[PDB]
């Protein structure tokens, strides 16, 4: 779960607006987790695609087949806007719910790797 | 005599069992961790069930 | 009475009798070393009035963890042709007991390639990783051993 | 094959002939040489370790056997081949830490 | 698969899912129909497996097939023993082995 | 397991002291049939059984919760041993 | 809207039940549970307790019979017997064979209420003078219960055999893309059921859904707590 | 036999449900479908669109407000309302705020049949001289529908928002082996349910099993075409 996918199909393709990257994904010219440059910022298709206000929504979208846990997206977690994977947030919540305090859990876990 | 064993004696067995622990041993014994305390849990089958973490 | 069931004539178990651990395969009686019953003991003996008798029970009973059905029967008694038995010994009685053993939790399984293993819990046919044609798999081995 | 043959745990045809009977005790064969030879079958004999030694005949009554041809299998034999374990359908994968 | 379509069945949706995620990680050549991808996966030894507990397919493809497996001498039947109070040796009072 | 074990570790310097304490307390409890307890009916460690939910016959657990309360006093040369056991039997038949 | 339920069967052995359209992912949500309860809890048949005249135990060798009693019993587990009466919880099938013939499941002495769904099932080969008297006691129930569990005692030499009750041999289901929706991504559920013939796949499906429903209304009025 | 069903809940948000004792294999059989249903089925709340002032683009910043458009959109996805009538499948909520203000969901201008069950929530932070007018479009739906699926402009520059429909946050059940007398193998089914509070987990559960048995009643009338 904590391992994140990277595809080479997009291959750092540049777009002016997120819409071009979007349509480019529809068409299959640019991969999901493939690193791309939208506007001047560097991001991924999935990061613009899936933006969640909370872990529960993310896991709902994932468990419904719209997304996989290994994909890089954007999510709002513990008062922070993060670009990470659903399975990782899952991990953090596993540890937190195991200990009972997700705050100190998140404090001592590496969410980077 | 006569392995008459009935739910009475099994539930009584779990009456004496409760809260008490037994020592598990694996040869060769190198560490002290080669012996660790665990609980009786009555289970069908003749094999002893061990936790996956303490295996190491 | 009930423990003497399958013992038909000479005190040997019949052919095709299930023998539980503790059940008597063949009966035998050996005179006890003559000694007093203890005061409490003889108080009991008097209470039940059951005659303290001579011989005591030496009978062979199948060991714990073992049991099955009786197939073979062999009796070699001395004073009979074809057999010479060692001095002091009257007769030897031997019983074949066969067991039907299905695969059980904890039994060992392995392949020709040197992959060992123990049976860890059996799984009902209901939940199995199966094929699209409904054909379930028979084992589920772990790749991490490879 | 040769394993089950040289193990002598199986019954074969000593010469050319015909099976005149089966059942689980005596497989009788009338050989070309004219002699009628029955082969007694050992059924469920206790071994050293306790593993049963058994011989199951595969021949129909009345078909003519060649010489060296199989009559009855061994405990570890199937139609003249070594049968040790069984062939099962395996899936290689982690299952619930079991 | 020929017998699958002979019985009037196409490719299952769950199989399309597994084939998709196998395609993303590149176990099958992109652009090829689900039949040819299931084909490319099949000769790899890996097929699509459904979990009998859920009914949902396993994320990755899993090798299955016929293995020759052996029951051996050691059994729990013979090797399980426990004791409370039994006989003891005459010389020293240690229990027997 | 044995909940509160961390706090129990914190109660004493050396662990073996704690073990001795729990041992002797469980001993007292087994002696007097759980009538010397400092616990209250709600705090009593109840074993779940279909026949009914009873007092946990395990004295060790009882001693654990007992020391977890803090109503128990422990130490070296605290009271004379003889008088201790003496009036110990004096209180509870 | 209302899904169109079609049932296309074959014989008493095979059946195919198509339900479409359905919600996204629902084909699994339905298909799998029914498959489980099918393969497990469907009430069966398949004997109990076998006796042969000269046989004191399962490993005895019967004169005139090429097969040992354990292989014959092994073939007696494969015997599919159907009751025509829901009232009969048990019965006894009698079989007698002589001479150089081959004893099969269709050679049993016929009786009311009982029928063999596989008359070509091989029991034993009988040679010259081979005479086999056999009586099988067929009870019926649900699931897989080994012989080592149930006691019998019905006669001194009576032999307990393993019992596979559930009439369902195998169940598969396929979820596909249905043309029958307002939208895309809708499921067509196809239930493929293979049974021995004691119970038709349709009946099996019926009582499976019934059991599932009964276990479904097990959720009623619970007891409440608020920590 | 007859299983005991118990329910331990907390507030209108959280709930726990235990079915036990239960026959083997049935714990998962019940567990998975209800889990799939609760997330993919139960009817609901959840805004579809949002229109805002002086912003024509989804990524473009808003003067006078600390949070950008996206953050506001997220906070609006967190917002949970309730309809007081079945007749209304859609509505429109309005909001206007000026000057230094902490803008909550309670400051949202009310509507006829629309009741906000989330009065205390953080929508936006308005600085000195901050001007905010917005009209959010809240429709009624099920499961989860992304902004990609249905984009919605009933307004000139309306921003389609991911609509999280199902009132159920997360399910996450568990089965464990429990014992009664002899047999240690029985299914103890512990089903936890998280919801937003529009419906209490008990209601969501009963409604779910209602949907399930409704789908199970879909096997009634067979039409036989024999291959």
Swiss-Prot record, chain A:
Family as reported in the entry's similarity comment: Belongs to the RNA polymerase beta' chain family.
Organism ancestry: Bacteria, Thermotogati, Deinococcota, Deinococci, Thermales
Functional note: DNA-dependent RNA polymerase catalyzes the transcription of DNA into RNA using the four ribonucleoside triphosphates as substrates.
Name of the gene this protein is made from: rpoC
Full protein segment contained here: 792 to 904 of 1524
Protein name: DNA-directed RNA polymerase subunit beta'
Source organism of this protein record: Thermus aquaticus
Highest taxon of the lineage: Bacteria
Quaternary structure and partners: The RNAP catalytic core consists of 2 alpha, 1 beta, 1 beta' and 1 omega subunit. When a sigma factor is associated with the core the holoenzyme is formed, which can initiate transcription.
Swiss-Prot record, chain C:
Name of this chain's protein: DNA-directed RNA polymerase subunit beta
Family membership noted in the UniProt record: Belongs to the RNA polymerase beta chain family.
Shown segment, full-protein numbering: 731 to 876 of 1119
Biological role: DNA-dependent RNA polymerase catalyzes the transcription of DNA into RNA using the four ribonucleoside triphosphates as substrates.
Subunit and interaction comment: The RNAP catalytic core consists of 2 alpha, 1 beta, 1 beta' and 1 omega subunit. When a sigma factor is associated with the core the holoenzyme is formed, which can initiate transcription.
Coiled coil region boundaries: none
Curated annotation (Swiss-Prot), chain F:
Enzyme class: transferase
Gene3D superfamilies: 3.90.940.10
GO CC, alphabetical: DNA-directed RNA polymerase complex
InterPro entries, per database record: DNA-dir_RNA_pol_omega, Pol_omega/Rpo6/RPB6, RPB6/omega-like_sf
Any one biological process term the GO annotation gives: DNA-templated transcription
One example GO MF annotation: DNA-directed RNA polymerase activity
One protein family per Pfam: RNA_pol_Rpb6
Keyword Magnesium: no
EC numbers: 2.7.7.6
Record key words, sorted: DNA-directed RNA polymerase, Nucleotidyltransferase, Transcription, Transferase
Catalytic reaction annotation: RNA(n) + a ribonucleoside 5'-triphosphate = RNA(n+1) + diphosphate
SMART domains: RNA_pol_Rpb6
Family according to the record: Belongs to the RNA polymerase subunit omega family.
Protein purpose: Promotes RNA polymerase assembly. Latches the N- and C-terminal regions of the beta' subunit thereby facilitating its interaction with the beta and alpha subunits.
Oligomer status and interactors: The RNAP catalytic core consists of 2 alpha, 1 beta, 1 beta' and 1 omega subunit. When a sigma factor is associated with the core the holoenzyme is formed, which can initiate transcription.
Protein name: DNA-directed RNA polymerase subunit omega
UniProt organism field: Thermus aquaticus
Swiss-Prot record, chains G, H:
E.C. no: 2.7.7.6
EC supergroup of this enzyme: transferase
Record field: catalytic activity: RNA(n) + a ribonucleoside 5'-triphosphate = RNA(n+1) + diphosphate
Gene Ontology cellular component annotations, sorted alphabetically: cytoplasm; DNA-directed RNA polymerase complex
Keywords: DNA-directed RNA polymerase, Nucleotidyltransferase, Transcription, Transferase
GO biological process, one term: DNA-templated transcription
GO MF term list: DNA binding; DNA-directed RNA polymerase activity; protein dimerization activity
Region entry Alpha N-terminal domain (alpha-NTD), spans: 1-223
Domains (record comment): The N-terminal domain is essential for RNAP assembly and basal transcription, whereas the C-terminal domain is involved in interaction with transcriptional regulators and with upstream promoter elements.
Described purpose of this protein according to its UniProt entry: DNA-dependent RNA polymerase catalyzes the transcription of DNA into RNA using the four ribonucleoside triphosphates as substrates.
Annotated family: Belongs to the RNA polymerase alpha chain family.
Subunit structure and binding partners: Homodimer. The RNAP catalytic core consists of 2 alpha, 1 beta, 1 beta' and 1 omega subunit. When a sigma factor is associated with the core the holoenzyme is formed, which can initiate transcription.
Protein name as it appears in the record: DNA-directed RNA polymerase subunit alpha
Lineage start: Bacteria, Thermotogati, Deinococcota, Deinococci, Thermales
Full protein segment contained here: 7 to 233 of 314
